[PDB]
Design a protein around this motif. Sequence first.
Motif, PDB file in Angstrom:
ATOM      1  N   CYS A   9       4.081  -3.782  25.738  1.00 36.18           N
ATOM      2  CA  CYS A   9       3.332  -3.485  24.524  1.00 36.18           C
ATOM      3  C   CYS A   9       3.762  -4.468  23.423  1.00 36.18           C
ATOM      4  CB  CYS A   9       3.730  -2.093  24.040  1.00 36.18           C
ATOM      5  SG  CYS A   9       3.316  -0.743  25.144  1.00 36.18           S
ATOM      6  N   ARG A  10       2.860  -4.712  22.477  1.00 29.00           N
ATOM      7  CA  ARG A  10       3.215  -5.459  21.274  1.00 29.00           C
ATOM      8  C   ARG A  10       3.344  -4.445  20.150  1.00 29.00           C
ATOM      9  NH1 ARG A  10       0.784  -5.887  25.132  1.00 29.00           N
ATOM     10  NH2 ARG A  10      -1.289  -5.981  24.165  1.00 29.00           N
ATOM     11  N   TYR A  11       4.353  -4.638  19.327  1.00 28.61           N
ATOM     12  CA  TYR A  11       4.586  -3.761  18.177  1.00 28.61           C
ATOM     13  C   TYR A  11       4.630  -4.641  16.974  1.00 28.61           C
ATOM     14  CZ  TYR A  11       5.612   0.195  21.113  1.00 28.61           C
ATOM     15  OH  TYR A  11       5.488   1.257  21.974  1.00 28.61           O
ATOM     16  N   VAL A  14       5.185  -8.103  18.074  1.00 34.37           N
ATOM     17  CA  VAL A  14       6.368  -8.457  18.850  1.00 34.37           C
ATOM     18  C   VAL A  14       6.329  -7.829  20.203  1.00 34.37           C
ATOM     19  CG1 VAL A  14       8.902  -8.343  18.872  1.00 34.37           C
ATOM     20  CG2 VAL A  14       7.665  -8.633  16.687  1.00 34.37           C
ATOM     21  N   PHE A  15       6.675  -8.610  21.208  1.00 33.12           N
ATOM     22  CA  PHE A  15       6.759  -8.126  22.574  1.00 33.12           C
ATOM     23  C   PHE A  15       7.916  -8.747  23.314  1.00 33.12           C
ATOM     24  CE2 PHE A  15       4.478 -11.654  24.860  1.00 33.12           C
ATOM     25  CZ  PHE A  15       3.954 -12.311  23.790  1.00 33.12           C
ATOM     26  N   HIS A  16       8.268  -8.128  24.451  1.00 32.67           N
ATOM     27  CA  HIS A  16       9.355  -8.570  25.292  1.00 32.67           C
ATOM     28  C   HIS A  16       8.807  -9.202  26.556  1.00 32.67           C
ATOM     29  CE1 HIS A  16      12.129  -7.259  28.649  1.00 32.67           C
ATOM     30  NE2 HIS A  16      12.926  -8.078  27.978  1.00 32.67           N
ATOM     31  N   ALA A  36       3.349 -20.574  24.804  1.00 29.99           N
ATOM     32  CA  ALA A  36       2.264 -20.376  25.769  1.00 29.99           C
ATOM     33  C   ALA A  36       1.460 -19.099  25.515  1.00 29.99           C
ATOM     34  CB  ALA A  36       2.794 -20.414  27.187  1.00 29.99           C
ATOM     35  N   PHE A  37       2.049 -18.130  24.819  1.00 32.73           N
ATOM     36  CA  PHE A  37       1.338 -16.936  24.398  1.00 32.73           C
ATOM     37  C   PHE A  37       0.833 -17.091  22.950  1.00 32.73           C
ATOM     38  CE2 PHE A  37       4.109 -14.925  27.634  1.00 32.73           C
ATOM     39  CZ  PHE A  37       3.178 -14.184  28.307  1.00 32.73           C
ATOM     40  N   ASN A  38       0.729 -18.339  22.420  1.00 32.79           N
ATOM     41  CA  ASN A  38       0.322 -18.570  21.014  1.00 32.79           C
ATOM     42  C   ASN A  38       1.245 -17.787  20.070  1.00 32.79           C
ATOM     43  OD1 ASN A  38      -3.332 -18.711  21.491  1.00 32.79           O
ATOM     44  ND2 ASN A  38      -1.848 -20.381  21.232  1.00 32.79           N
ATOM     45  N   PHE A 101       6.422 -13.260  19.264  1.00 35.74           N
ATOM     46  CA  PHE A 101       5.671 -12.686  18.167  1.00 35.74           C
ATOM     47  C   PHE A 101       4.333 -13.380  18.072  1.00 35.74           C
ATOM     48  CE2 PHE A 101       4.325 -13.382  13.771  1.00 35.74           C
ATOM     49  CZ  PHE A 101       3.868 -12.104  13.549  1.00 35.74           C
ATOM     50  N   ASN A 102       3.257 -12.609  18.174  1.00 39.36           N
ATOM     51  CA  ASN A 102       1.920 -13.132  18.036  1.00 39.36           C
ATOM     52  C   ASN A 102       1.327 -12.564  16.735  1.00 39.36           C
ATOM     53  OD1 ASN A 102      -0.927 -13.485  18.184  1.00 39.36           O
ATOM     54  ND2 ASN A 102      -0.652 -14.079  20.299  1.00 39.36           N
ATOM     55  N   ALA A 103       1.153 -13.413  15.740  1.00 45.71           N
ATOM     56  CA  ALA A 103       0.657 -13.000  14.444  1.00 45.71           C
ATOM     57  C   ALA A 103      -0.724 -12.413  14.461  1.00 45.71           C
ATOM     58  CB  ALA A 103       0.712 -14.191  13.486  1.00 45.71           C
ATOM     59  N   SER A 104      -1.514 -12.666  15.515  1.00 40.79           N
ATOM     60  CA  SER A 104      -2.882 -12.164  15.613  1.00 40.79           C
ATOM     61  C   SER A 104      -3.000 -10.812  16.302  1.00 40.79           C
ATOM     62  CB  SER A 104      -3.747 -13.175  16.358  1.00 40.79           C
ATOM     63  OG  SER A 104      -3.802 -14.371  15.598  1.00 40.79           O
ATOM     64  N   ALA A 105      -1.867 -10.259  16.779  1.00 40.64           N
ATOM     65  CA  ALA A 105      -1.896  -8.982  17.440  1.00 40.64           C
ATOM     66  C   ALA A 105      -2.145  -7.886  16.405  1.00 40.64           C
ATOM     67  CB  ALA A 105      -0.576  -8.745  18.178  1.00 40.64           C
ATOM     68  N   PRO A 106      -2.398  -6.668  16.866  1.00 36.67           N
ATOM     69  CA  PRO A 106      -2.592  -5.563  15.910  1.00 36.67           C
ATOM     70  C   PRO A 106      -1.313  -5.244  15.130  1.00 36.67           C
ATOM     71  CG  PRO A 106      -3.546  -5.040  18.106  1.00 36.67           C
ATOM     72  CD  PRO A 106      -2.656  -6.258  18.265  1.00 36.67           C
ATOM     73  N   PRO A 107      -1.462  -4.591  13.977  1.00 37.93           N
ATOM     74  CA  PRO A 107      -0.301  -4.392  13.107  1.00 37.93           C
ATOM     75  C   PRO A 107       0.717  -3.375  13.580  1.00 37.93           C
ATOM     76  CG  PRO A 107      -2.233  -3.318  12.197  1.00 37.93           C
ATOM     77  CD  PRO A 107      -2.711  -4.225  13.280  1.00 37.93           C
ATOM     78  N   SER A 113      -2.838  -3.943  27.804  1.00 39.88           N
ATOM     79  CA  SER A 113      -2.222  -4.951  28.638  1.00 39.88           C
ATOM     80  C   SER A 113      -2.531  -6.359  28.160  1.00 39.88           C
ATOM     81  CB  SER A 113      -2.671  -4.740  30.076  1.00 39.88           C
ATOM     82  OG  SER A 113      -4.086  -4.687  30.114  1.00 39.88           O
ATOM     83  N   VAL A 114      -1.696  -7.295  28.597  1.00 36.67           N
ATOM     84  CA  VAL A 114      -1.870  -8.711  28.300  1.00 36.67           C
ATOM     85  C   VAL A 114      -2.701  -9.266  29.454  1.00 36.67           C
ATOM     86  CG1 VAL A 114      -0.647 -10.886  28.068  1.00 36.67           C
ATOM     87  CG2 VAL A 114       0.317  -8.807  27.073  1.00 36.67           C
ATOM     88  N   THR A 115      -3.797  -9.943  29.143  1.00 38.78           N
ATOM     89  CA  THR A 115      -4.762 -10.425  30.130  1.00 38.78           C
ATOM     90  C   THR A 115      -5.003 -11.928  30.008  1.00 38.78           C
ATOM     91  OG1 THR A 115      -6.560 -10.021  28.606  1.00 38.78           O
ATOM     92  CG2 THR A 115      -5.959  -8.197  30.041  1.00 38.78           C
ATOM     93  N   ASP A 116      -4.094 -12.667  29.352  1.00 37.95           N
ATOM     94  CA  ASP A 116      -4.236 -14.100  29.234  1.00 37.95           C
ATOM     95  C   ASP A 116      -2.887 -14.735  28.926  1.00 37.95           C
ATOM     96  OD1 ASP A 116      -3.952 -13.564  26.401  1.00 37.95           O
ATOM     97  OD2 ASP A 116      -5.729 -14.775  25.845  1.00 37.95           O
ATOM     98  N   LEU A 117      -2.796 -16.049  29.098  1.00 36.37           N
ATOM     99  CA  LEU A 117      -1.627 -16.884  28.743  1.00 36.37           C
ATOM    100  C   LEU A 117      -2.353 -18.058  28.095  1.00 36.37           C
ATOM    101  CD1 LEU A 117       1.419 -17.355  28.942  1.00 36.37           C
ATOM    102  CD2 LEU A 117       0.981 -18.577  31.051  1.00 36.37           C
ATOM    103  N   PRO A 118      -2.781 -17.878  26.831  1.00 37.24           N
ATOM    104  CA  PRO A 118      -3.814 -18.752  26.265  1.00 37.24           C
ATOM    105  C   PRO A 118      -3.451 -20.180  25.985  1.00 37.24           C
ATOM    106  CG  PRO A 118      -2.979 -17.230  24.622  1.00 37.24           C
ATOM    107  CD  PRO A 118      -2.518 -16.720  25.943  1.00 37.24           C
ATOM    108  N   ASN A 119      -2.161 -20.434  25.849  1.00 34.98           N
ATOM    109  CA  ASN A 119      -1.712 -21.751  25.477  1.00 34.98           C
ATOM    110  C   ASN A 119      -0.787 -22.396  26.469  1.00 34.98           C
ATOM    111  OD1 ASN A 119      -1.914 -23.922  23.588  1.00 34.98           O
ATOM    112  ND2 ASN A 119       0.082 -23.295  22.753  1.00 34.98           N
TER     113      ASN A 119
HETATM  114  C1  LIG Z   1      -4.543 -11.404  19.723  1.00 34.69           C
HETATM  115  C2  LIG Z   1      -3.518 -10.976  20.747  1.00 34.69           C
HETATM  116  O1  LIG Z   1      -3.347  -9.796  20.914  1.00 34.69           O
HETATM  117  N1  LIG Z   1      -2.890 -12.086  21.442  1.00 34.69           N
HETATM  118  C3  LIG Z   1      -1.876 -11.975  22.464  1.00 34.69           C
HETATM  119  C4  LIG Z   1      -0.706 -11.286  22.195  1.00 34.69           C
HETATM  120  C5  LIG Z   1       0.290 -11.208  23.159  1.00 34.69           C
HETATM  121  C6  LIG Z   1       0.080 -11.812  24.402  1.00 34.69           C
HETATM  122  C7  LIG Z   1      -1.092 -12.513  24.639  1.00 34.69           C
HETATM  123  C8  LIG Z   1      -2.097 -12.580  23.685  1.00 34.69           C
HETATM  124  O2  LIG Z   1      -3.289 -13.296  23.877  1.00 34.69           O
END
Ligand SMILES: CC(=O)Nc1ccccc1O
Length: 150
Positions: A9-11, A14-16, A36-38, A101-107, A113-119
């Motif tokens: 989970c992201r809080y 922030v995630f582990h 790699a997770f932006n 830490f992903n600044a674009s995640a929810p507050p 679940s995480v469904t991408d590795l965007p970067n």
């Molecule tokens: C916007 C958002 O929730 N991005 C993100 C956060 C953590 C892991 C992968 C992600 O793409």
Amino acid sequence: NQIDLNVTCRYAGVFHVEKNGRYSISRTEAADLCQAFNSTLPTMDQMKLALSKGFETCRYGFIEGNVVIPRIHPNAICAANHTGVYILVTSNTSHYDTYCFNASAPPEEDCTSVTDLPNSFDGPVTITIVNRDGTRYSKKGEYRTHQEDI
Ligand SMILES: CC(=O)Nc1ccccc1O
């Protein structure tokens, strides 16, 4: 040529991230992994806010400047029963998990679940994101920029 990345989970963003089911990430690899997770290595203030939203683990991981375990509930085998952001003080060794830490995640709590590795970049590794609910996302690539981490 495979890497498993167990994520939480992201809080407050922030995630582990645990690599290959063991403490195996260097500080340089951790920055590259979060990129790699932006994402970036969380600051201590970002981690303290994530803790306040419900984040806790039982694993050492890098943040910016330190290696920590966020704890909410005292547990004798997690950070010696401490609560708060527990900071590792003395260790012989250099490899841990990481926090990102992903600044674009929810507050607040985001336990989707995480469904991408965007970067991640082009590369030969099959990288598999493993969620706590077992769902997986895999992609061929690379995220390590330092040869000594490969
Ligand atoms: C916007 C958002 O929730 N991005 C993100 C956060 C953590 C892991 C992968 C992600 O793409």
